[PDB]
Amino acid sequence: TLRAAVFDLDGVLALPAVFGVLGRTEEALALPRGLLNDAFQKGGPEGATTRLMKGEITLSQWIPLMEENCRKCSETAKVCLPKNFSIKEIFDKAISARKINRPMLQAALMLRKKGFTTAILTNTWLDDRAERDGLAQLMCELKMHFDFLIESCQVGMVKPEPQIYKFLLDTLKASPSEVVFLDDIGANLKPARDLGMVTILVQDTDTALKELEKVTGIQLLNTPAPLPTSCNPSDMSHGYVTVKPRVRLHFVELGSGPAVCLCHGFPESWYSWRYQIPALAQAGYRVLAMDMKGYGESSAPPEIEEYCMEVLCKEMVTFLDKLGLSQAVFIGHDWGGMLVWYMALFYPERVRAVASLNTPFIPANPNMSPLESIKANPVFDYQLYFQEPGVAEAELEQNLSRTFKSLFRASDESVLSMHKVCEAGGLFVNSPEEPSLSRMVTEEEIQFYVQQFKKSGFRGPLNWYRNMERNWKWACKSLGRKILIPALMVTAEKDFVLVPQMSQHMEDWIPHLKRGHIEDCGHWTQMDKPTEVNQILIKWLDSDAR
Template sequence: MGLRAALFDLGGVLVRPSANVIFSQAEEDLALPRGFLNKVITQGGLESPYLHLMKGEITFLQWVPLMEEDCRKLAAASKFCLPEQFSIQKIFEDMISKGKINYPMLRAAITLRNKGYKTCILTNNWVDDGPQRDVVAQLMCTLSKHFDLVIESCRIGMVKPDPEIYKFALEALKVGPHEAVFLDDIGANLKKARELGMVTILAQDTDMALKELEKSTGIQFLNHSVERPIAVQPNNVAHGYVEVKGVAEAELEQDLTRTFKSIFKGSDEKMDSISTKHIENGILKNVKDPFLSWMLTEEDINYYVQQYKKSGFRGPLNWYRNWDANWRWSCTATKRRILIPALLVIAENDMILSPQLSENMEKWVPYLKKERIKNCGHWTQLERPREVNQILIKWLKDVTKNPSVVSML
């Protein structure tokens, strides 16, 4: 029977650099003997504090003083002194802060899942009550949605390379050992999995590991000519000034009526004197008494004002501040097509989402229907509500008349 499941280690495989790389760098920076940290971690056998940590029997902050005491003991036995700035907590916080998603490996996992494989993150991990626990939580949240299962040692009381953790994972995935491939950056972890009958791949080098994964699964992952989304520097676009937290909020919330009257303009109306230079100092500094657009009434403006008095602009502005993370996330969907029916309404005079931006979208959204509204700007629903409604109703009617299309929804 062929492979039906793929299991991926977290640190060193899905997230780089590995703990060993961070440990080696710390040892070099602190003038510690090579392999010192790993030696402290692995000593003690079944009563090792590190083993208790990975089983979830103690938390990270409970483990730190135990680990530092063991470091002092080993240093004394080895006849050298730990430097004053030595801190296990700092070393691990450094490991967390430097950890970045290994996107080629993540894309491989996503591809396998799209091909029908069951996928799993299988990791030795700890209960994190440290100051950077939100970073770890966010990372796990980002990764976990791309996998069928996440198994952390601290949640189940079993630690790699104990064969029981592999049996637990295989049972949870409902596959046999010979139906699963496991990628890890530690040879000892792979050895026990291999003895159970699992296919194993040492993943210390991503390209080499992916080549091995291609051989094992018959699926291609490495494609160096892949098209990627184009990165944009926030300062090169109109919303650049939102990057400086607090500046945009202070200006936009200073006079909400002025803000909304300045923002909402029809394509046939003269824009107020919104600054496009030195935007880090604000964009409305030259706007004194903006006129009310024909698209809205004073009652409409007052509604916006009352809503934003309650919520402020921080939430909406944070969407723009998240552009870099959104772009990195979009890279995980490289070459993936959207195969459900879609409608794009284009405004001919939109200065923000110009019609040119939609060119070649059909390549990635093959069932896309484009409709263009002439003599219309960015605020389509305000400027041309009748035309927008007609387009929506017609498209929905056409879609629902086609059974093959309806089945995609």
């Protein structure tokens, strides 16, 4: 039966209702009860407020009309308005107080996830106030979660006029009996009900949601915590910058405010940050989520030395130079974590702050060859297995789906020991042909990785592991320095390759290092514990990069 759900903005998706500040203001100021509402509604379908709601005039033009109205109401009720009474002030304050009503948004999201078409239908105004940006931000955040946003001032019609409902129905490509409509004003529900829509009168949120649950047959209340918002690749702005003749870097870009450059690990993608990108943009950052060199839509030259840290870092500086960015905050995971530490040591003037997930900062040992260092840790055996050009490429390219499905697994789901890989003859030699799907990833998300890696395969990616000696010699140049810009290290309790204890000496080199630690989190940190990652990065960004 029901296929569509329609929510109002004031008093339903957003609270406190701005309508409601008339009531509060009368109470706070000891005015005659309803005086401000009388003024707000004066003239009815031909008064100032209706012309505003229909888009005939803007909010700033309406303000002095309401003011006049407030005077007229107070004269006929034989009172005075307080010295300094200000409609502009009252409304600035109420529009900024009003916030997304999170449980109602999450119900709309869940219904949309079960197949509902969702819409916002609202009587609202053209906002040209000095502070309009606050409302623009609220609308942006809400509207990406709905199929349609219908605004009275854009369509020239207002609730309760019957034409707006017919316009709704026609927008929804739905008959009225397939629709549930929620509003906190009973007069606004009435024409929907006359057409045989299910309607819900919203006073407190929980009761409305109980009625909504009952009538749709879907669980909306007491539901577990949902995942952060993810990214749909074809909805992103995609950027491309040529950093030298055969090397162009692709990135996805969302948000405004301080530039934050996200650098993924092996064998990954910009898409590995899909849960961080909307959260960090929504927190007030300009996010640039890279395809690192060798991956996705970035160039992937075959030569091994094109992937040494020195070359990669110099390219990332060029990337900032071409974008006209004097700095970015650099956040990396895995190989990208290693990269951002080297950015901080060699280009601190370009790094506003630095954060790594999983990858520790360990100074090079000038008295031991890196390949021997590597041979000393049984869990890095797979790194020796990666050395010989063509061997790991053949195994990893042989069946991409099985490759990402076998790699991307939560800590309780493993099919790969990283144990004696060379001796085993490969990474997947004792893994199934058809792994089950991790709880972390959908089959669609796997096929996105699979399609990215069809372009250039694993040569470029593996090459990141093939510059151990060259990276060691470059790193030895930096052994006298410390990292003294703002820095965060995020350890993952159950990453059994990049273990939290490997980071334990970092304060000797980064004395003011901050930390976060994520329990029950494997190697694929951003997608294993996306909620916790987001919280830790935004806290650290707002305190240290701001």
